[PDB]
Structure formats: structure tokens, C-alpha cells
Scaffold this active site. Structure first.
Site, short mmCIF file in Angstrom:
data_model
loop_
_atom_site.label_atom_id
_atom_site.label_comp_id
_atom_site.label_asym_id
_atom_site.label_seq_id
_atom_site.Cartn_x
_atom_site.Cartn_y
_atom_site.Cartn_z
N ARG B 12 0.82 -1.22 0.00
CA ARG B 12 0.00 0.00 0.00
C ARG B 12 0.86 1.27 0.00
NH1 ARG B 12 -0.03 1.89 5.59
NH2 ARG B 12 0.07 0.12 7.05
N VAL B 13 0.30 2.38 -0.48
CA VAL B 13 1.05 3.64 -0.47
C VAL B 13 1.15 4.12 0.99
CG1 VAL B 13 1.44 5.91 -1.57
CG2 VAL B 13 0.29 4.13 -2.86
N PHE B 15 3.17 7.34 2.12
CA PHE B 15 4.00 8.46 1.65
C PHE B 15 5.11 8.92 2.60
CE2 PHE B 15 3.03 12.52 3.69
CZ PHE B 15 1.84 12.25 4.38
N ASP B 16 5.02 8.55 3.87
CA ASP B 16 6.07 8.89 4.85
C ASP B 16 7.33 8.09 4.59
OD1 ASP B 16 6.24 10.94 7.00
OD2 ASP B 16 4.23 10.25 7.54
N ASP B 226 52.75 17.38 -51.66
CA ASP B 226 52.15 17.68 -52.93
C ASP B 226 52.17 16.44 -53.82
OD1 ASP B 226 52.45 20.77 -54.83
OD2 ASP B 226 50.70 19.65 -54.05
N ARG B 256 49.42 22.37 -53.52
CA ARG B 256 49.40 23.32 -54.65
C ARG B 256 48.14 24.18 -54.68
NH1 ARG B 256 53.09 19.43 -57.40
NH2 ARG B 256 52.94 19.68 -59.70
N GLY B 264 53.58 15.96 -64.58
CA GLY B 264 53.30 14.66 -65.18
C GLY B 264 52.08 14.53 -66.09
N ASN B 424 46.04 21.09 -32.74
CA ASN B 424 45.00 20.07 -32.87
C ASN B 424 43.60 20.65 -33.11
OD1 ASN B 424 45.12 20.99 -30.14
ND2 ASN B 424 43.74 19.32 -29.61
N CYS B 426 41.46 21.35 -30.97
CA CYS B 426 41.06 22.24 -29.91
C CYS B 426 42.02 23.35 -29.67
CB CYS B 426 40.86 21.46 -28.64
SG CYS B 426 39.62 20.24 -28.93
N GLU B 428 44.93 23.61 -28.23
CA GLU B 428 45.74 23.74 -27.04
C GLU B 428 47.05 22.91 -27.18
OE1 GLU B 428 42.94 20.48 -26.29
OE2 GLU B 428 44.35 21.34 -27.76
N1 LIG Z 1 4.98 1.44 0.86
C1 LIG Z 1 5.53 2.48 0.20
N2 LIG Z 1 4.82 3.61 -0.07
C2 LIG Z 1 5.37 4.65 -0.74
N3 LIG Z 1 6.64 4.64 -1.19
C3 LIG Z 1 7.47 3.57 -0.99
C4 LIG Z 1 6.94 2.40 -0.27
N4 LIG Z 1 7.93 1.50 -0.21
C5 LIG Z 1 9.01 2.04 -0.84
N5 LIG Z 1 8.74 3.28 -1.30
C6 LIG Z 1 9.67 4.17 -2.05
C7 LIG Z 1 10.66 4.89 -1.15
C8 LIG Z 1 11.83 5.16 -2.08
O1 LIG Z 1 11.72 6.47 -2.63
C9 LIG Z 1 11.71 4.14 -3.21
C10 LIG Z 1 12.85 3.12 -3.18
O2 LIG Z 1 13.02 2.65 -1.84
P1 LIG Z 1 13.36 1.11 -1.52
O3 LIG Z 1 13.21 0.95 -0.02
O4 LIG Z 1 14.69 0.85 -2.20
O5 LIG Z 1 12.16 0.27 -2.25
P2 LIG Z 1 11.49 -1.12 -1.74
O6 LIG Z 1 10.87 -0.91 -0.38
O7 LIG Z 1 10.62 -1.70 -2.82
O8 LIG Z 1 12.76 -2.10 -1.64
P3 LIG Z 1 13.35 -2.74 -0.27
O9 LIG Z 1 12.71 -4.12 -0.23
O10 LIG Z 1 14.85 -2.73 -0.52
O11 LIG Z 1 12.93 -1.83 0.85
O12 LIG Z 1 10.47 3.46 -3.00
C1 LIG Z 2 47.59 14.19 -61.41
C2 LIG Z 2 46.73 15.12 -60.60
C3 LIG Z 2 47.34 15.95 -59.67
N1 LIG Z 2 46.58 16.77 -58.95
C4 LIG Z 2 47.24 17.64 -57.97
C5 LIG Z 2 47.25 17.09 -56.55
C6 LIG Z 2 48.64 17.34 -56.00
O1 LIG Z 2 48.65 18.32 -54.96
C7 LIG Z 2 49.42 17.91 -57.15
C8 LIG Z 2 50.74 17.19 -57.28
O2 LIG Z 2 50.75 16.42 -58.46
P1 LIG Z 2 51.05 14.85 -58.37
O3 LIG Z 2 49.84 14.09 -57.93
O4 LIG Z 2 52.28 14.50 -57.55
O5 LIG Z 2 51.34 14.54 -59.90
P2 LIG Z 2 52.83 14.75 -60.42
O6 LIG Z 2 53.67 13.56 -60.01
O7 LIG Z 2 52.83 14.97 -61.92
O8 LIG Z 2 53.31 16.08 -59.65
P3 LIG Z 2 54.73 16.76 -60.00
O9 LIG Z 2 54.37 17.83 -61.01
O10 LIG Z 2 55.38 17.29 -58.74
O11 LIG Z 2 55.71 15.75 -60.56
O12 LIG Z 2 48.61 17.76 -58.32
C9 LIG Z 2 45.16 16.79 -59.16
O13 LIG Z 2 44.43 17.55 -58.51
N2 LIG Z 2 44.53 16.01 -60.05
C10 LIG Z 2 45.25 15.17 -60.80
O14 LIG Z 2 44.66 14.45 -61.64
MG LIG Z 3 54.65 15.20 -57.83
#
Ligand SMILES: Nc1ncnc2c1ncn2[C@H]1C[C@H](O)[C@@H](COP(=O)(O)OP(=O)(O)OP(=O)(O)O)O1
Ligand SMILES: Cc1cn([C@H]2C[C@H](O)[C@@H](COP(=O)(O)OP(=O)(O)OP(=O)(O)O)O2)c(=O)[nH]c1=O
Ligand SMILES: [Mg+2]
Ligand SMILES: Cc1cn([C@H]2C[C@H](O)[C@@H](COP(=O)(O)OP(=O)(O)OP(=O)(O)O)O2)c(=O)[nH]c1=O
Ligand SMILES: [Mg+2]
EC number: 1.17.4.1
Lengths: 715, 737
Positions: B12-13, B15-16, B226, B256, B264, B424, B426, B428
Site C-alpha cells: 500500500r502507499v 507516503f512517509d 604535394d 598546390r 606529369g 590540434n 582544440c 591547445e
Molecule cells: N509502501 C511504500 N509507499 C510509498 N513509497 C514507498 C513504499 N515503499 C518504498 N517506497 C519508495 C521509497 C523510495 O523512494 C523508493 C525506493 O526505496 P526502496 O526501499 O529501495 O524500495 P522497496 O521498499 O521496494 O525495496 P526494499 O525491499 O529494498 O525496501 O520506493
Molecule cells: C595528377 C593530378 C594531380 N593533382 C594535384 C594534386 C597534388 O597536390 C598535385 C601534385 O601532383 P602529383 O599528384 O604529384 O602529380 P605529379 O607527379 O605529376 O606532380 P609533379 O608535377 O610534382 O611531378 O597535383 C590533381 O588535382 N589532379 C590530378 O589528376
Molecule cells: Mg609530384
């Protein structure tokens, strides 16, 4: 008076179709920006510009235009190669004062010790073989320049690259010089930018396993990416081993935030280091963070999926997909196919899953991403590993930036690539017969080139270098496939095309291997050769169950390869080839014409361009007029509905949208049996619905494609 | 109606029994204002039938604290109730709790997770006997409700929700955690912690005697250089330190400038700003519910300074912002001279102009000039312009912190190592850093109000003995700390620096009955800090004898008999014989290059009940949020309640006055005197006092400035004053209103 201008435009009209080129036209526009003040050099560009606008009237304008501006470059740069080189070396940056050579001493001194043989090898008439937009591409970026003004003619730059590859070997240099300048193939941009210089970063793409699932891991891997992007490279990154959101962390006794926050870190690293980044991130669909993944472009990273077959099986049989955390379920990316489905299920039948979804629902979130952004790309992990020649090395974890390269990667190997591309349109003879004897021949040279490139190359990080030295993988591509078909008279989808497609690739591959063998005869195989499918007699087409056509005796070749092996773990991979195909006036890679009309900016504004092949049929048949052109723009580039055009051409110039993607997929499937790596497959769907898409992936998947899809395009 | 007892037994409830239980805990409290029947009445309304007897403890300790506003004793009482609770909820014997914490199996993850290290246990265990009976639980009743709830919220360990540790078990773990088999000293430390004479920094409080002890709070980094490679190496470090819950500050000046040539690649450098985005992105992604905290140190000759300056703004453009880094300036004397004499000021690239940051003072002044003369400049501006820029940054954000490179290097005992490139987080910590060395710091603070007596005289003799102890503890930490990175460990074992701090400085004046700004207070401020330096050196000396100097001792200012105060030209008062010590050192040398570092005791001040760091009260009325509670300056309230001068409206008329007691016509002036807020006090006087104590602090001091209505005039004059005082950190935060 304007007569003095015309008769001078006319000079460079040789061999051009004068039914449609008319110099009087240019003069009438040029003679007006005239005054008592400036003269000729100014008017030189003026006309080039004007001519270049006129491309819509006829393709020869592009060429006329080109020629004029070329003439003008020659009229303002040194003739003798060695002398141009001499200046590039000496360039003291008169900004600070420190010496900055633009070419490398060794390349100089090689050039000077043969100033005789190299100088008189160069044919400068070859600078007129480029079209305007092509030339302007070179001039923006490829030709070396001292303070403003360009120094290198395009021949100079080719010769530079050539000796920049074959160093002390002049013969090999002059044969590479020729091949290149006649446009029989091209090297990748990094090679053309950097061959012969102080930073010879020639490779063109790297791949990268995520070193490890710790902060230490994630940040070492990051250090590396930064470093590769510095020296240019594009990157694929394998990311699947990173523990997912929620996954516990012992050391801090906290809870990880997962893959995405980590993809932000990388994204951010790409906005930084440039010479814009470009990473492909590859994730496997079983990772618990796969859903967030699919919202990210939905940012300086491109996402791609490392699909295991299991997943596709579950999706089509409406089923249960379980997302795991790689920390909770280790080794899931270290394994593929069979050992994967065993290990994966083991974890499923052990409860240890973090969350279950329906397979079908994940699938549909993918279709959502692709319709939105065009990504993620679809690559099939199991297909890639099954048909890989590098499978003896382990599990292949991902691909490159454009999904074409499939190579092994580890904690201490970062895969690289060295690429080049054969211009397929060059081998169709003036009889509409395709010259394969000559195609094979040129490949063999490209192999020797790429192979030389491995050893001389500058590697940005040490395990790029360790990787490449062990397995010596190369990558060879193609451009102008579409122009080949047109020059032959073949509708892209015609059975006639469909054979040629196989044949071309039977050939590229035959030559590559044959050349790889001669090199193995000469210097032995790469050290992780024995153990691989080729020591076992199983070449790429076998893995697909394809038996090639009788065009080449593979019988004979296998007996050679059985004797001395090969030099390179891998050889072929058809790539986007975006920047180069612009120079050569070709359609990119293996794809149809996306449109019969398109533009191109060149410093100020653009130029409106119709398909060169096309315009030539329409004008000769006298079908080309104002509203005729104005209408095709209305039809987004198709000519199907324009009534007065023959049956013949409507078939011949169908745009990629009007083409059957099923057929596209099937055709890649074909050639892909002779591609030992993969291919950059874009998909074009005009009006998409989730149905069309889903069979697409499934169709291509069933075909057994290493890359299912690069980009989806919608409108 | 009923209450469920501590065993399910309906009572039963009655509340105390509440009032009765409360009374039992009023030993030593001045009962004339603490009526414990006041709580009872207020408890038994917020009270339904069947509520737990444990809840009549919380409900009651909560009520008890809302009556701090009547007599601070109440706040101590509120704690007593929460503790008289905790004890009932806790195992008494110490060595038992240690067993639980170790043997604790993770009830989710079926596996095992100790919460103490095996060694710490095996010591505690094999030393059960002495350690158990050592603990005095009647010390747990000596905190107030607010300190207590901070302790409860993060400083005692919870076994699955349930707080296992009593505050003494914690204090004890920390002692054994520092002292291991040295059981005499563990107990002596435990006694001095539990009697509230000092407090170890939080990271020590947290981790002491746990496994892989992160005992240190702060870390300093110089960029690796690069290079893309240098950048990313320094980024891996920062990541690695942030994962270990460490605060960071970084030297970024070598990078670049926006524009600079890149060999290339032929391209060009995008500058500091872009790189700082990458550092923000990484700070966001690595943690410690708490994101990492980096302080970025720039030198004002770097071309990118103006960008560096608007980066902290919440107003501008998304691309060029970084609200997660904290910005700081490493300021040469030259810049300041250039400002006050309206001369031009040149901005350089560290690429075209190498070596600037690796050199200070006149060596700098020479090198910088000979670049200007050489035309090695990228942009030249009026010095005042940059200074105007700096002071609006501060007006809008309160940052950048203000450090003076030339003071820091001139007056540092790490001088013999090289230039100190930064501070990084953040401000820091003032330590050396290099490619090979990241400076850690290990910290603690003394509760400066513990050493004043009932007869209003100060016990320096005792203050010096407590300091000795701390130095012995901070030293051992160095050898037991787990270093996030190897260069951290390198550094710390090399130069063995330690940073000893303080809290309750303003509390110290108030007990003596001094205004912060009097001759009295200002003598004691000097005397106190002399005392700390003296005691600490004497400690480090004894250790040197016991163990040897710190490796890099020879050639340092000390190894020459130059003590901090020498570097200021300040003769100490005659409180202590500094020539006896100087003779003692020149004998045995010392053990720790650096010693004193007044950091901002953020949360350990909340616990001990002290006011922050070296600072006077911000208000005589304030808030601490836990409901957030309405604290009145405990000291003040006593003088008012004593002099029968306390009621409802007065408590209010002060809130009206922003916690000022000045205008109140009913208060004696000598009280209006003692209890001035910081917004009443002369900051110049603040700056003078720091400077005055600065002569005895071998590092720096986190030092906020409070200026009510701030303008360019006031901000400028304030910096320059402190600058001319010889301060190393001339300003941490600027606080306004
Ligand atoms: N008869 C009751 N009426 C109203 N509240 C209650 C009653 N019994 C427990 N409570 C509440 C008080 C706490 O806020 C909450 C948890 O308390 P707790 O004592 O751990 O529960 P419980 O009584 O079911 O387990 P335990 O068997 O361990 O006493 O439940
Ligand atoms: C080949 C290629 C390079 N890139 C860019 C990314 C890289 O920062 C930059 C470097 O090229 P790399 O990818 O190294 O090509 P590479 O070897 O010819 O360069 P390098 O002239 O030094 O010899 O090129 C592209 O955005 N798209 C592409 O298709
Ligand atoms: Mg290169
Ligand atoms: C410490 C920490 C880790 N992580 C990530 C990175 C990694 O993917 C994962 C943990 O890897 P680690 O960094 O290696 O953590 P750990 O080794 O101390 O713990 P454990 O051995 O249990 O794995 O979580 C954070 O996202 N934030 C953090 O603050
Ligand atoms: Mg780990």
C-alpha cells in the site's frame, strides 16, 4: 574578283564529285567577311567553316573542308619530322624557365640516329585522307602544340607513336607507320596521346578487386583508384565483399552504415582527380544493399551487375531470393557457377540470410533503373567465368568500364588493358568482296604492337604491372562494322550480313592467335599459360559449342598452339572506340547507324550531318532537296516513311531503332564465340515496356552472352 | 492504492516512507533550505496505483533536480536518490562485476565478447583481496544529478541495457587499467579520482582496462605532400584515426594552389578546396552516432586562403562547402605586422615557392621576402583586405581559430625537432609532426576548486602532489595506449609529450571570493599555474631518473635549462624555488618534452560539477539537457539563500537579464562583483590572464572569446592585443549574441 577565291577553292577539288560540290557556293559566303585589313590565312578558315556547313548538301564538302584547313596547317608547320620532334623535346616553358621536353630523349635520340630513314618515309599527302570533323578532332587533342599553335602534323604524330612503340626497330616502325596512316587500324587514345613521351601511360582501362573489407582495405583501394585516374585510366571496381548496412563491427562495437555511404566516398574521389573520373561499380545481386544500389543514378560512378545464373533462374520461375551480408556469408564472390550455387544454398539452408525478397521483385527494380538511367549494365558472372581463358587463375570478380574486358583480379593484381581497333570498312574491296587475307594480316601486326606496348608501358601502380606481366592479356576491337555492311550492299540484318559477321570475327581471331603463337615460338608463353583452357586444346569457340566455317583450317592452328602455346592470355574485345572512330569517319564499333542524321560541335556551335553512305545514294538518284532533308529530322532519322525512295535503300539504311534487337543480340551471340573477352552491347528500344526488356535480357542471357547489355537507350 | 516493491510484493502507499528514505540521504546537507517533504508532495501526485518502487525512485530523483532552482544541495540530493537506486540494482563487490563484464556472452550474436581485457581481469582477480575492500561506495553519493546522468549515459558499462558498473567500479577499472600489477599506485590513483581531485580524459575513462585501449583523444597530422599519393596516404591515416574515435588537426599548407602547374599530366591543380571536399566526405563517412572531426590548418600566405575562408558558410553554393571540417589559421608574425602598417601582402603557391611552412620566425621573414623580390608571387593584395575577410568569417561562423606560428615555435620545447606546422582540433596542443610522425596527445585535468580550504587560503603544496601523480599516469598511458597508426606510436615514444589541463578555474576564484578580474584573482592565477608546472617538472624529473630522458631531450630548450617562463621573460613569484628544480633537472633531465595543455574539459566538467576549463561563468542561470533542467550557479544561490534574498521573481528578473545579476537593486555589490557573466568581463583582461598563465604552460590553451555586439573594431583590437601578449592560441571560438 571572287574568281581569285573560287579558282583557289577549286585547287583542292581533285577527285571530288563536282555534280554536287560547287566552289562558287563557298566564295559567295566567304567574299563578305573581306576588307582592307586581314587577308588569306583568315579567309582560309572562313572557307573551311563554310564548306563544312555544306556537308548536308554532299559528303565531299567535309573532305573539301578538311583539305583546305589541312593545306593551312602545312602552310604553318615544319615539314621535316625530326625537326618537329627536335622542337618538342627542347621546349623550355618560357613561362617559368625550367626545361620541359614534350617528347622523351630516347625517342628523340632514336629518331635522330635515323633521321635519314624516318624522315623520307612520311607521306604528308596522307593528312588529306581525314574528313573535316575527323581532322578537327585530332587538332583539338592529338597533335602536340607549343604555346597556342599546333606543332605536329598528323603524320608527325603517327610516326611519333610508331617509333614510340618500335623504338630501336625501324622496319616495324615504318610498317606500323604506314598501316596507321592509311587508316587500316588505330591504337587506343592513351597510346596516341602518350606514345613517345615522358609519361608513357598507354594502357586504357583497369580493373580492381576491392582489396579487403576494412577501413584499411577501403582506403588503400581508394588510394589506388586516385592514382590510376591521375594518369588517365578508367576503372572497374569489384565491391561486393563490403559488409552491408546494419552489419556489426567488432573493433568499434558499432554498426556499419553499408555500401552506399562508401560509394559516396569514391564518387567524391572521382569529382577530384581528373586527367572527371569514371568508375564502374560492380555489385552482385545477393548483397543485402543491392536495393539502395539501384537508386544512386536514380553519380560520377556507373553501376553494373555481376549476375550469377542462379539469379536468372529464380526470376523466371517466380522465386525466393535471399540477400546476404558478405561478412556474415564469406567467399560468395570468390566462387562461381556450381561451387557458387552449392555454397550460396548452404548459407540459405543454414538460415544465415539477412532478408528474403521474391526474385521477381528485385528483377523489376532493375528494369526500373535501366528505363530511368540506362543503367545498371548486365553481365553474366557465370558465362564470363565459364568461357574465360583465365579461369585457372581463379574467380573473375568483375569487368572494366565498358563491360568488354573480362580479366582476373586479386589483392595484388590489378588488371589492365591495352587496346586497338581494326577498321572493318577498309577491307571491303571495290568489288563488294571482303578481303579476309588482308584482315588477318593486319591483326597479326596489331598483336605485335599491343604486345610490345605491355613491356614499355608506364604502370600507375605496381600490381597493374605485376598483373599484366604474368598473363599478358591484350584487347583488340573493331570499328565501322556498319559501314562494311553498307559498302558491301548488305542490310545490317540480311542473312548476307549475318555470315560476314561470323567470318570477319573468325578471321580477326584466327590471325590474333596465329600471331600470338609465333610470339610464343619466339619468346615463350606467358607464365600462367599452362593450366589454362588453351593448354587443353579448348579455344574460345569450343566453349560456345560453335564449329567454325571452313574458311580457315583451325585444325592446322591448334597443332601450332599445341606445339609452342600463345603469348597472351586473352586477345579480342570489341569496345566503344568512341573518340577514335570520330577521327576515322566511322560508326562506333559493332553498332548500326543510331540515326541517318546527327550533329557535332566544333568550338563554336555545330554541323548537321547525314549518313555519308546514304547522302551519296539520294543525291545521285536526284532525290535530295530542302524539305527532303527537313523531313528526315521530323522522323528522328529514319527514311522508312519517305515515299519516293526505292525498296533497295529503305532496307539498307534502317536505323538501330528500326532493327530487331533480338537479331542484334543473336549477331553478337554469333561473333561472341570468337571473342575471347566480351563486347560493349548497347540496346535500343524505342517505346519500352517491362515485357520487351525482360525477354531482351533473357534472350541474350539464353544466347550465353558475357555482357548482356551495356547501355539501354530509350529515346 | 499500492506500490509494487523490489520483488513484486504489493505494498500500500505510505507516503512517509518516501520522505523517510529521502531524509536518510541528507547527511552533510544544509537542511534549512532542503525540505525533503517538498519532493514527497510533488511525487505523490505524479503517481498511479501499482507503479514500481523503482519508478518512485526515478520520478523522485527527477523531481528532486527541478528544485536545484531552490538550493543546489537539492541537485546533490537528486543524485543520491538515483545512486541509492543504482547500488540496489548493482553487484556490490568490484571483482565480481569485472567477472561479468569479461564473461559476458553476446546474447544476440551467440559468440563471446569480453568488455574488459583478460589481463585487467587476471590482475583484478589475483588482486581481489586488496582492491575490493579499497572501494568506498560512500563516494558515489558525492556527485550531483547532472554529472551522474552523464556518467550513466556513457561512462559506466551496460550489460544488455542494464548498467553493470557502479561509478567506483568504473573509477577502479580505470586505475588498474593504468597501473596493472602496480597495485600500490592503482589504489592511490583510485583514491584521488574518487575523491575528485582530477579526472582522466574521456577516451581513457571509456577504454582504460578494456581490450586494445584507445586511451588518447588528440592527433596531429602534416600532409604527406604535394602528391595524389601523399594526399591519399594522409587520408587513410585520418580515416584510421577517426575509426579509433580520435580528434584530428591537419597541416594542409603544402598543397598546390588553384591553378598551379602539374608536370606529369600537363593539366592544372584544382587547389585546396576540392581536396577539402574529399576530407569532408571522409569525415562524414568514418565515425567513432558521431562523425569524425578534422581541424584544417592553413597559413595565410597560401593563394587559396580566400576560398578557405567562405567554406564554413551555410550560405553560398553546394560545391564549395565543408560544414564538417573545422578551420584554423597558422599565422606568421609577418602577416600581422603587414596588417597594422597597411602594406601589401603576397599570396604564393607552395609549389613555385617551396619551404614556407617548414620554417618560422625570421628564417621565414627572410625566405618569404626573397621570393617576393624574385617575383615568385601569383597574386598580391592589401594585407588589410585579407584581415577583413578573416574577421567576417569569424562574424558569420565563429571560425577560423587563430594560432600564431611564430609564438608556438619560438616558445616550444620541441623546437629542436623542427617547425611545428599545426595545432590540434582544440588548439591547445602544440606538437611536431612529419612524414614519419603523427603527434598524439594524452590528457587529464585538475579540479581547481578542490584545493581551496574552509579558511579561504589555497593549498598549492597539495596541488603539486596531485599533479605529480597525474604525470606518472599520463606516462604509463603512452606505453599502454593502442595506436591507430604506427607513426602515432613512433612520435609518442620518441618525445613522450603529455598535456595536463584544468577545470573549475572560475569556481576556484569564487570559493576564495575573488572577482575574475581582481589583483587577488590575478595573483592566484599566476601562482596556481606556477605550481602545476613546478610539480609536473619535478615529476618528469623523477621519472627521467627512474628511466632516462625522452629520446630527443638533448639540444632542446630544457636540456639547456630554459623553462617555459624563460621563453617569455617572466620572473616567477617566490612561491616555489625554481633554481632548486633547475639544478634537479640538469642532473637527471626530464621524461616528457611537454607537460601542460589547458584543454576544454567538455564533459568531464559536467561530471565533476565544475565550470569549463580556464573560463568564467557564461551565466548565473543556465540549461543542461537530459527534460532539460534550469540550473542556477550553485555558488551564487548559496549567498542569496544565506542572506535571505531568494524568491520567484528574482529568479525570473535574472532570466529577464540574460543571467546577469548586475542591475538587481537588492544585491550587495561585492556579490554583483564576484558573479559577473563572461559578457560583462573584459576580454582584454581574459587575454592578459591567459598570457600571464601562458608563461607556465609549455603548450597552449583553448580559449574562447565572448563578445556581445561584435564589429570589425572590436574583433580586430581583440586579436592584436592577445597577439602582442605573446599568445600561441589567440582565439579558439568567437561566441557572440
Ligand atoms: N509502501 C511504500 N509507499 C510509498 N513509497 C514507498 C513504499 N515503499 C518504498 N517506497 C519508495 C521509497 C523510495 O523512494 C523508493 C525506493 O526505496 P526502496 O526501499 O529501495 O524500495 P522497496 O521498499 O521496494 O525495496 P526494499 O525491499 O529494498 O525496501 O520506493
Ligand atoms: C595528377 C593530378 C594531380 N593533382 C594535384 C594534386 C597534388 O597536390 C598535385 C601534385 O601532383 P602529383 O599528384 O604529384 O602529380 P605529379 O607527379 O605529376 O606532380 P609533379 O608535377 O610534382 O611531378 O597535383 C590533381 O588535382 N589532379 C590530378 O589528376
Ligand atoms: Mg609530384
Ligand atoms: C570503424 C568503422 C568501420 N566502418 C566500416 C568499414 C568496414 O566495411 C567495416 C568494418 O571493417 P574494419 O574497419 O576493419 O573494422 P574492424 O576490423 O575493427 O572490425 P571487424 O574485424 O569486426 O570487421 O565497417 C565504418 O563505416 N565506420 C567506422 O567508424
Ligand atoms: Mg576488419
Amino acid at each position: 574578283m571572287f574568281d581569285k577565291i573560287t579558282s583557289r577553292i577549286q585547287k583542292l577539288c581533285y577527285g571530288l564529285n563536282m555534280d554536287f560540290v560547287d566552289p562558287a557556293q563557298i566564295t559567295m559566303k566567304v567574299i563578305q567577311g573581306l576588307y582592307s585589313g586581314v587577308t588569306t590565312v583568315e579567309l582560309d578558315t572562313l572557307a573551311a567553316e563554310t564548306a563544312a556547313t555544306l556537308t548536308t548538301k554532299h559528303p565531299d564538302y567535309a573532305i573539301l573542308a578538311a583539305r583546305i584547313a589541312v593545306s593551312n596547317l602545312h602552310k604553318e608547320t615544319k615539314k621535316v619530322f625530326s625537326d618537329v620532334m627536335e622542337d618538342l623535346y627542347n621546349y623550355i616553358n618560357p613561362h617559368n624557365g625550367k626545361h620541359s621536353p614534350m617528347v622523351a630523349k630516347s625517342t628523340l635520340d632514336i629518331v635522330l640516329a635515323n633521321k635519314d630513314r624516318l624522315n623520307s618515309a612520311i607521306i604528308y599527302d596522307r593528312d588529306f585522307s581525314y574528313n573535316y570533323f575527323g581532322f578537327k578532332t585530332l587538332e583539338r587533342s592529338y597533335l602536340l602544340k607549343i604555346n597556342g599553335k599546333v606543332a605536329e602534323r598528323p603524320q608527325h604524330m603517327l610516326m611519333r607513336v610508331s617509333v614510340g612503340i618500335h623504338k630501336e626497330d625501324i622496319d616495324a616502325a615504318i610498317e606500323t607507320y604506314n598501316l596507321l596512316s592509311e587508316r587500316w587500324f588505330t591504337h587506343a587514345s592513351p597510346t596516341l596521346f602518350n606514345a613517345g613521351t615522358n609519361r608513357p601511360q598507354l594502357s586504357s582501362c583497369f580493373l580492381l578487386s576491392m582489396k579487403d573489407d576494412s577501413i584499411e582495405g577501403i582506403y588503400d583501394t581508394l588510394k589506388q583508384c586516385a592514382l590510376i585516374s591521375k594518369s588517365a585510366g578508367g576503372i572497374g571496381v569489384a565491391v561486393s565483399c563490403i559488409r552491408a548496412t546494419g552489419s556489426y563491427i567488432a573493433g568499434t562495437n558499432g554498426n556499419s552504415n553499408g555500401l552506399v555511404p562508401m560509394l559516396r566516398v569514391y564518387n567524391n574521389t572521382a569529382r577530384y582527380v581528373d586527367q572527371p573520373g569514371a568508375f564502374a561499380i560492380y555489385l552482385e545481386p545477393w548483397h543485402l544493399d543491392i536495393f539502395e544500389f539501384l537508386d544512386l543514378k536514380k553519380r560520377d560512378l556507373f553501376f553494373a551487375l555481376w549476375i550469377p545464373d542462379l539469379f536468372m533462374k529464380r526470376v523466371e520461375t517466380n522465386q525466393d531470393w535471399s540477400l546476404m551480408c558478405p561478412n556474415e556469408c564469406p567467399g560468395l564472390d570468390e566462387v562461381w557457377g556450381e561451387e557458387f550455387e552449392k555454397l550460396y544454398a548452404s548459407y540459405e539452408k543454414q538460415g544465415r540470410v539477412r532478408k528474403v525478397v521474391k526474385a521477381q521483385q528485385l528483377w523489376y527494380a532493375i528494369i526500373e533503373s535501366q528505363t530511368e538511367t540506362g543503367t545498371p549494365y548486365m553481365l553474366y558472372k557465370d558465362s564470363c567465368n565459364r568461357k574465360s581463358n583465365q579461369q585457372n587463375l581463379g574467380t573473375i570478380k568483375c569487368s572494366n568500364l565498358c563491360t568488354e574486358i573480362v580479366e582476373y583480379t586479386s589483392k595484388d593484381e590489378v588488371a589492365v588493358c591495352n587496346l586497338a581497333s581494326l577498321a572493318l570498312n577498309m577491307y571491303v574491296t571495290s568489288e563488294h568482296t571482303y578481303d579476309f587475307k588482308k584482315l588477318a594480316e593486319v591483326t597479326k601486326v596489331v598483336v605485335r604492337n599491343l604486345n610490345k606496348i605491355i613491356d614499355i608501358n608506364y604502370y600507375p601502380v605496381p600490381e597493374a604491372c605485376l598483373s599484366n606481366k604474368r598473363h599478358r592479356p591484350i584487347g583488340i576491337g573493331v570499328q565501322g562494322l556498319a559501314d562494311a555492311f553498307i559498302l558491301m550492299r548488305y542490310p545490317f540484318e540480311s542473312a548476307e550480313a549475318q555470315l560476314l559477321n561470323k567470318q570477319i570475327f573468325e578471321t580477326i581471331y584466327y590471325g590474333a592467335l596465329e600471331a600470338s603463337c609465333d610470339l610464343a615460338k619466339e619468346q615463350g608463353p606467358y607464365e600462367t599459360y599452362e593450366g589454362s583452357p588453351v593448354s587443353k586444346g579448348i579455344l574460345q569457340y569450343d566453349m560456345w559449342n560453335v564449329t567454325p566455317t571452313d574458311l580457315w583450317d583451325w585444325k592446322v592452328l591448334k597443332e601450332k598452339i599445341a606445339k609452342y602455346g600463345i603469348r597472351n592470355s586473352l586477345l579480342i574485345a570489341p569496345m566503344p572506340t568512341a573518340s577514335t572512330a570520330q577521327i576515322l569517319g566511322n560508326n562506333e564499333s559493332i553498332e548500326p547507324y543510331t540515326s541517318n542524321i546527327y550533329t557535332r560541335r566544333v568550338l563554336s556551335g555545330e554541323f548537321q550531318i547525314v549518313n555519308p553512305h546514304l547522302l551519296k545514294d539520294l543525291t545521285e538518284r536526284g532525290l535530295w532537296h530542302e524539305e527532303m532533308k527537313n523531313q528526315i529530322i521530323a522522323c528522328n532519322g529514319s527514311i522508312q516513311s519517305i515515299p519516293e525512295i526505292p525498296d533497295d535503300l529503305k532496307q539498307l539504311y534502317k536505323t538501330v531503332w528500326e532493327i530487331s534487337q533480338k537479331t542484334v543480340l543473336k549477331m553478337a551471340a554469333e561473333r561472341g564465340a570468337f571473342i575471347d573477352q566480351s563486347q560493349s552491347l548497347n540496346i535500343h528500344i524505342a517505346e519500352p515496356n517491362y515485357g520487351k526488356l525482360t525477354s531482351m535480357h533473357f534472350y541474350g542471357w539464353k544466347q550465353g552472352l558475357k555482357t548482356g547489355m551495356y547501355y539501354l537507350r530509350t529515346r
